[PDB]
Amino acid sequence: GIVEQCCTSICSLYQLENYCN
Amino acid sequence: FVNQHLCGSHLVEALYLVCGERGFFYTPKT
């Protein structure tokens, strides 16, 4: 989930936008 | 600001800025 993808590895806009409503 | 390690409040803030009026969900356990 987000912590694995954006905190413990480098985030991306592609990935952040999956968490927008 | 997206293309780096984003933890805790820094992650929340990035979600807030990117998602804007759509809002977002923050689920650190999943």
Residue numbers in the entry:
A (entry chain A): 1 to 21
B (entry chain B): 1 to 30
Give the text the authors published on this PDB structure.
To demonstrate the versatile applicability of spitrobot-2 we demonstrate reaction initiation and fast delay times in three independent model systems, obtained by single crystal rotation data collection: Streptomyces rubiginosus xylose isomerase (XI), human insulin (HI), and bacteriophage T4 lysozyme (T4L). Using 12 crystal structures of three independent model systems, we demonstrate successful cryo-trapping via observation of conformational changes and ligand binding within 25 ms. Spitrobot-2 is an integrated benchtop solution for cryo-trapping protein crystals with a delay time of less than 25 ms. It is suitable for monitoring ligand binding events as well as conformational changes of main and side chains.
Human insulin (HI) is a 5.8 kDa peptide hormone produced by β-pancreatic cells, which facilitates the absorption of glucose from the blood into tissues. In its active form, HI consists of 51 amino acids divided into two polypeptide chains: A and B (21 and 30 amino acids, respectively). The secondary structure of insulin shows two almost antiparallel α-helices in chain A and a α-helix followed by a turn and a β-strand in chain B47. After a century of crystallographic research, insulin has been identified as one of the most polymorphic proteins, displaying a range of molecular conformations, crystal forms, and binding capacities for metals and ligands. Several cubic insulin crystal structures have been analysed under different conditions, such as crystals in 0.1 M sodium salt solutions with pH values ranging from 7.0 to 10.049 and in 1 M Na2SO4 at pH 5.0 to 11.050. It has previously been reported that cubic insulin crystals undergo a structural transition when the pH is lowered from 9.0 to 5.050, while their crystal packing is not affected. The conformational change of glutamate at position 13 of chain B (GluB13) is accompanied by the binding of sulphate ions close to phenylalanine at position 1 of chain B (PheB1). Here, we aimed to induce this effect by a pH jump with spitrobot-2.
